[PDB]
């Protein structure tokens, strides 16, 4: 601008305040693809994914949130959990659409199963049905000689892809052959990745490894098609990643020095959270912990690659237990409970500086629920990452509760509830009378019969730049439709949109959402 007191240009009054596109108000729906309806026992990246995206577009939503897309562990009672993944980078092959594979010529229609029970994902039977079909398709692709073969080759050879995929495939092949509970007990040449032993693995387990890679290509291609379609409809996809990875994975076995392990590869300390006046005992998660000191020395290369893959899949993503980047609870690996442990200093902002330098700008959402400390808030603010507000947590304390709308801020993501909460209707049904009174009063004395509308509107009308509603709440569903109960080992991650509900029959629901998005400037 000119010197103080001097003339501005004649057109000064046209220099109107700028609206940063990153600040655009948006609304989204939380719906994990396993929850899509259809005849094959689990939702997939096929015809229903596109019907869903059409419905989202009709509803005026510009975001779709999913849970992690990784292959869930099947080795306990974590049945189907997106948060107990077998690998940090691979896609869940159960999400691969049998119909799209028929379109590709990799499966024959006659090979597809007769329609399976539709109400709920049965994680105990679904792999036995779908795995052989995905394998058949992968084998057909491997023996083919056209455009898809060429694409498979480009995929396998891509330096970003190969940085995790080769290790993931060899890990799975060895796991299949050796079949111990963990790699800690593998024969030393395989445990310690002797060059000759790995060469021998590819010779003896060639087919397994080739098929594993082909399956990951099939996932990649289907996911890309979905993401491209979403983008065509003005819809971004928000993913999710746990801060930690599991011990028995290629992530650890192929990158041992990234983790705090002893000389025999056993974790020295493991993840958890301490007691916070709850049942005397805290929570023992048991994941290996990162050697953040070692990581800083190479510019956080392992974390950079993890982020690269996340951006290959998602437009933006939440990191669970974001507080772990500021401070993390460490339990000696011998302990059977979380009581005995210490808080350790996390990597802080330098991790995010290195990510920025390597990968560029990313919308990372900080999961910041529960008791968090001041350093966590300062870290989050320092990288301009939005935290969370969850309306189902807002009404049981006092007016300073950060989840209450009058306490929201613009750079934040507001939910009615997440996959960890009951549905609005389910939550209401078990809510104590005193809290019910408080909710109704807060929401301008609305009727109990309109609680769902009240909470949905409370989210949409918030100043928070992103509002997310679970699909269950759009559908008016109760506790039988809850995705996860955090205390538990069974019945989780299995909810599906009922067979009788189809996206083409949800025009009324889309209009109802679109109208409030219009009113509250999210359209
Ligand atoms: Ca096994």
UniProtKB/Swiss-Prot annotation:
Keyword hit for Amino-acid biosynthesis: no
Molecular-function annotations in GO: 4-alpha-glucanotransferase activity
Enzyme Commission numbers on file: 2.4.1.25
Catalyzed chemical reaction(s): Transfers a segment of a (1->4)-alpha-D-glucan to a new position in an acceptor, which may be glucose or a (1->4)-alpha-D-glucan
Subcellular localization(s) per the UniProt record: Plastid, Chloroplast; Plastid, Amyloplast
Record key words, sorted: Amyloplast, Carbohydrate metabolism, Chloroplast, Glycosyltransferase, Plastid, Transferase, Transit peptide
GO cellular component: amyloplast; chloroplast
Pfam families: Glyco_hydro_77
InterPro entries: Glyco_hydro_77, Glycoside_hydrolase_SF
Keyword Transferase applies: yes
Tissue: Present in leaves, stems, roots, and stolons but is most abundant in developing and mature tubers.
BP-aspect Gene Ontology terms: carbohydrate metabolic process
Main location: plastid
Function recorded in the entry: May act during starch breakdown to convert small oligosaccharides into larger molecules upon which starch phosphorylase can act, or may change the structure of starch molecules and grain architecture by modifying chain length, or may generate from starch and glucose oligosaccharides which can serve either as primers for new starch phosphoenzyme.
Family: Belongs to the disproportionating enzyme family.
Protein name per UniProt: 4-alpha-glucanotransferase, chloroplastic/amyloplastic
Species name: Solanum tuberosum (Potato)
Gene name per UniProt: DPEP
């Amino acid at each position: 601008v000119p010197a103080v007191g001097e003339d501005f240009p004649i057109d000064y009054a046209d220099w109107l305040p700028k609206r940063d596109p990153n600040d655009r108000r948006r609304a989204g729906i939380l719906l994990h693809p396993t929850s899509f309806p259809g005849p094959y026992g689990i939702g997939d990246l096929g015809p229903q994914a596109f019907k869903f995206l059409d419905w989202l577009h009709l509803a005026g939503c510009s975001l779709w949130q999913v849970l992690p897309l990784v292959p869930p562990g099947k080795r306990g009672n974590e049945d189907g959990s997106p948060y107990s993944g077998q690998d940090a980078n691979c896609g869940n092959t159960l999400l691969i659409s049998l119909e799209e594979l028929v379109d590709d010529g990799l499966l024959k229609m006659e090979e597809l199963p007769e329609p399976l029970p539709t109400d709920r994902v049965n994680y105990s039977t679904i792999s036995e049905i779908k795995d052989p079909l995905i394998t058949k398709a992968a084998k057909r692709l491997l023996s083919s000689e056209g455009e898809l073969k060429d694409q498979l080759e480009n995929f396998r050879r891509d330096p970003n892809i190969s940085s995790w995929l080769e290790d993931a495939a060899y890990f799975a092949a060895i796991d299949n052959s050796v079949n111990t509970i963990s790699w800690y007990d593998w024969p030393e040449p395989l445990k310690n990745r002797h060059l000759a032993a790995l060469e021998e693995v590819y010779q003896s387990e060639k087919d397994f490894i080739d098929i594993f890679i082909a399956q990951q290509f099939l996932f990649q291609r289907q996911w890309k098609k979905v993401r491209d379609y979403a983008r065509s409809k003005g819809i971004s996809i928000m993913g999710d990643m746990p801060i930690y990875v599991g011990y028995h994975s290629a992530d650890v076995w192929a990158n041992k020095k990234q983790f705090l392990l002893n000389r025999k590869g056993f974790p020295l300390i493991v993840s958890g959270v301490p007691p916070d006046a709850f049942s005397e005992t805290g929570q023992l998660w048991g994941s290996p912990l990162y050697d953040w000191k070692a990581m800083e020395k190479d510019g956080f290369s392992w974390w950079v690659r993890r982020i690269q893959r996340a951006t290959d899949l998602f437009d933006e993503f939440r990191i669970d237990h974001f507080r772990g980047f500021a401070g993390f609870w460490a339990v000696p690996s011998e302990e059977k409970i979380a009581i005995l442990g210490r808080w350790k200093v996390g990597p802080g902002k330098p991790l995010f500086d290195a990510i920025l330098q390597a990968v560029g700008k990313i919308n990372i959402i900080a999961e910041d629920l529960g008791v968090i400390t001041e350093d966590v808030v300062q870290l989050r603010k320092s990288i301009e990452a939005p935290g969370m507000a969850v309306l189902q947590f807002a009404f049981g304390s006092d007016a300073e509760n950060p989840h209450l709308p009058h306490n929201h801020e613009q750079n934040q993501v507001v939910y009615t509830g997440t996959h960890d909460n009951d549905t609005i209707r389910g939550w209401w049904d078990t809510l104590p009378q005193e809290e019910k009174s408080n909710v109704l009063k807060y929401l301008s004395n609305i009727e109990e019969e309109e609680i769902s509308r009240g909470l949905i509107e409370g989210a949409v009308s918030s100043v928070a730049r992103i509002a997310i509603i679970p699909m269950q709440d759009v559908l008016g569903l109760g506790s039988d439709s809850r995705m996860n109960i955090p205390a538990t080992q069974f019945g989780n991650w299995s909810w599906r949109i009922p067979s009788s509900t189809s996206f083409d029959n949800l025009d009324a629901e889309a209009k109802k959402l679109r109208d409030i998005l219009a009113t509250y400037g999210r359209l």
